[PDB]
Curated annotation (Swiss-Prot):
Residues annotated as signal peptide: none
Protein name per its UniProtKB record: Fermitin family homolog 3
Function description: Plays a central role in cell adhesion in hematopoietic cells. Acts by activating the integrin beta-1-3 (ITGB1, ITGB2 and ITGB3). Required for integrin-mediated platelet adhesion and leukocyte adhesion to endothelial cells. Required for activation of integrin beta-2 (ITGB2) in polymorphonuclear granulocytes (PMNs).
Illness: Leukocyte adhesion deficiency 3: A disorder characterized by recurrent bacterial infections without pus formation, leukocytosis and major bleeding disorders.
Organism: Homo sapiens
GO cellular component: cell projection; cell-substrate junction; extracellular exosome; extracellular region; membrane; platelet alpha granule lumen; podosome
InterPro entries to which the protein is assigned, alphabetical: Band_41_domain (IPR019749), FERM_2 (IPR035963), FERM_central (IPR019748), Kindlin/fermitin (IPR037843), Kindlin_2_N (IPR040790), PH-like_dom_sf (IPR011993), PH_domain (IPR001849), PH_Kindlin/fermitin (IPR037837)
UniProt entry keywords in alphabetical sequence: Cell adhesion, Cell junction, Cell projection, Disease variant, Phosphoprotein
Record-linked PROSITE patterns: FERM_2, PH_DOMAIN
Cross-referenced Gene3D superfamilies: Phosphatidylinositol 3-kinase Catalytic Subunit, Chain A, domain 1 (3.10.20.90), Pleckstrin-homology domain (PH domain)/Phosphotyrosine-binding domain (PTB) (2.30.29.30)
Gene Ontology terms: biological process: cell-matrix adhesion; integrin activation; integrin-mediated signaling pathway; leukocyte cell-cell adhesion; platelet aggregation; positive regulation of cell migration; regulation of cell-cell adhesion mediated by integrin; substrate adhesion-dependent cell spreading
Length: 412
C-alpha cells in the first residue's frame, strides 16, 4: 500500500495534484475513480483518461494493474480529457477549430474528421504537423471554392525551386497507427488535412461536393505555390479554369496574377497574361462548376511529376544522397547528379517490405529475388513504410474499410 500522485490541472497540468493510496494490485479503473473522487467538481468524466509520460502511452486498459503496466511511484501520470481542440487547416487554406481524440490512432481521428466534413474515403487523406483568422463549420465554406489570393501572398510564401525542396513536405506526415499525444501534438496545435494518396476511388462530380472542392483546392495551391511544375500553356488553362470556377461560385478586372504561379507573374506583364487566359477560357466556358473542378483535377493528373511524393534517401552501398519517388503504383530512383530517373520498381512486383530498426533502413523484396535497401534522410522509415503499404492497401479497394489489413500493411 503505497503513494501515487497524479497531475490533475487543466490549464497548467502540473498546478493541481491528487494523491492516492494504491496497492500495485490497483486497477486503472479503480485509480481513475479515486482521482475523480478527490476532485471537488461535478461533470461528465467519461472522456477522461491517464497519460503516462515516460512510456508515451494512455492507460486505456481499465482492468490492468499498475504492476502489469509497470507503474511505480516515479511515473509521471496526467489525468485529462481524451478529446481536445485542434486547428485544422484545410486544403482550401481556411482553418477550422475542431475536437479531436488525442488517444485514438490517427487514421480513426482522420476518419472522424472526414465524417464531420462530409468527405468520403478518408483513407486517402491524412494529417501533417506544423512546419519547422479562424472559421466555423459550414457547408458553404467546405463546398464553395475560395477566392483567388492576393498575388503578393503567392510571391512571399516559401516555394520549392528544386526537386530536393519538394521532399520537405513529406517529413511532416503523422503516423496513422499512433495517436496525437504520442506524436508531440498538444491541444490548440495546427494540423493540416491533405490528400495523401493520389489514388481517388469513385470521385464523381455529383456525389462529393466537399471532397471535389477540397481536392481541387489542394491541386490549385500546389500549382500556385509551385509544388508541382507545368508549362506556360498548361498554366493558361489552369488559370482559365480557376477564373471560371470562381465566377460560377459568385453568382451562385480579371486580376491574372491571382491565377498563376509567381514564376509566370515575374516573367509576363498582366497585360500580356489576360488575353492568353481569356483565349484558354473560351475552351472551358460551357462547363459547370463541378465539371470545371474535375477538369482542373484531370489536367493536374496529366502533369509529368503528378502523383509522386519525393523522399531524400541513401541507397545501400551508395556514396551520395538520392531521391526516392513514391507514386501510386511504383517506386522510382532519381540520381541528383544526373537529374533523371535511373530505376523503377513496380508495386505489382513487390513481395515484402520491412524496416530493419537497428540500422534505420527500409528493405523491400521484389519478384525474381531483387532486393532494395535504403536509409531515410528526409522523412523517416515509418513515413516511407506507411506510404508504401498505404498505396498497396488502397489498391485493394475494388473488392467496409478493412482496418486490420491497413495496419498490417503499414506496419502498425
Amino acid at each position: 500500500s503505497w503513494e501515487l500522485r497524479v497531475f490533475v490541472g487543466e490549464e497548467d497540468p502540473e498546478a493541481e495534484s491528487v494523491t492516492l493510496r494504491v496497492t500495485g494490485e490497483s486497477h486503472i479503473g479503480g485509480v481513475l475513480l479515486k482521482i475523480v473522487e478527490q476532485i471537488n467538481r461535478k461533470q461528465d468524466w467519461s472522456d477522461h483518461a491517464i497519460w503516462w509520460e515516460q512510456k508515451r502511452q494512455w492507460l486505456l486498459q481499465t482492468h490492468w494493474t499498475l504492476d502489469k503496466y509497470g507503474i511505480l511511484a516515479d511515473a509521471r501520470l496526467f489525468f485529462g480529457p481524451q478529446h481536445r481542440p485542434v486547428i485544422l487547416r484545410l486544403p482550401n487554406r481556411r482553418a477550422l477549430r475542431l475536437r479531436a481524440s488525442f488517444s485514438q490512432p490517427l487514421f480513426q481521428a482522420v476518419a472522424a474528421i472526414c465524417r464531420l466534413l462530409s468527405i468520403r474515403h478518408p483513407e486517402e487523406l491524412s494529417l501533417l504537423r506544423a512546419p519547422e483568422e479562424l472559421y466555423d463549420l459550414s457547408y458553404h465554406m467546405l463546398s464553395r471554392p475560395q477566392p483567388p489570393p492576393d498575388p503578393l501572398l503567392l510571391q512571399r510564401l516559401p516555394r520549392p525551386s528544386s526537386l530536393s525542396d519538394k521532399t520537405q513536405l513529406h517529413s511532416r506526415w503523422l503516423d496513422s497507427s499512433r495517436c496525437l499525444m504520442q506524436q508531440g501534438i498538444k491541444a490548440g496545435d495546427a494540423l493540416w488535412l491533405r490528400f495523401k494518396y493520389y489514388s481517388f476511388f469513385d470521385l464523381d462530380p455529383k456525389t462529393d461536393p466537399v471532397r471535389l472542392t477540397q481536392l481541387y483546392e489542394q491541386a490549385r495551391w500546389d500549382l500556385l505555390l509551385e509544388e508541382i511544375d507545368c508549362t506556360e500553356e498548361e498554366m493558361m488553362v489552369f488559370a482559365a479554369l480557376q477564373y471560371h470556377i470562381n465566377k460560377l461560385s459568385q453568382s451562385g478586372g480579371l486580376n491574372p496574377y491571382g491565377l498563376v504561379a509567381p514564376r509566370f507573374q515575374r516573367k509576363f506583364k498582366a497585360k500580356q497574361l489576360t488575353p492568353r487566359i481569356l483565349e484558354a477560357h473560351q475552351n472551358v466556358a460551357q462547363l459547370s462548376l463541378a465539371e470545371a473542378q474535375l477538369r482542373f483535377i484531370q489536367a493536374w493528373q496529366s502533369l509529368p511529376d503528378f502523383g509522386i511524393s519525393y523522399v531524400m534517401v541513401r541507397f545501400k552501398g551508395s556514396r551520395k544522397d538520392e531521391i526516392l519517388g513514391i507514386a501510386n503504383n511504383r517506386l522510382i530512383r532519381i540520381d541528383l547528379a544526373v537529374g533523371d530517373v535511373v530505376k523503377t520498381w513496380r508495386f505489382s512486383n513487390m513481395r515484402q517490405w520491412n524496416v530493419n530498426w537497428d540500422i534505420r533502413q527500409v528493405a523491400i523484396e521484389f519478384d525474381e529475388h531483387i532486393n532494395v535497401a535504403f536509409s531515410c534522410v528526409s522523412a523517416s522509415c515509418r513515413i516511407v513504410h506507411e506510404y508504401i503499404g498505404g498505396y498497396i492497401f488502397l489498391s485493394t479497394r475494388e473488392r467496409e474499410l478493412d482496418e486490420d489489413l491497413f495496419l498490417q500493411l503499414t506496419g502498425g
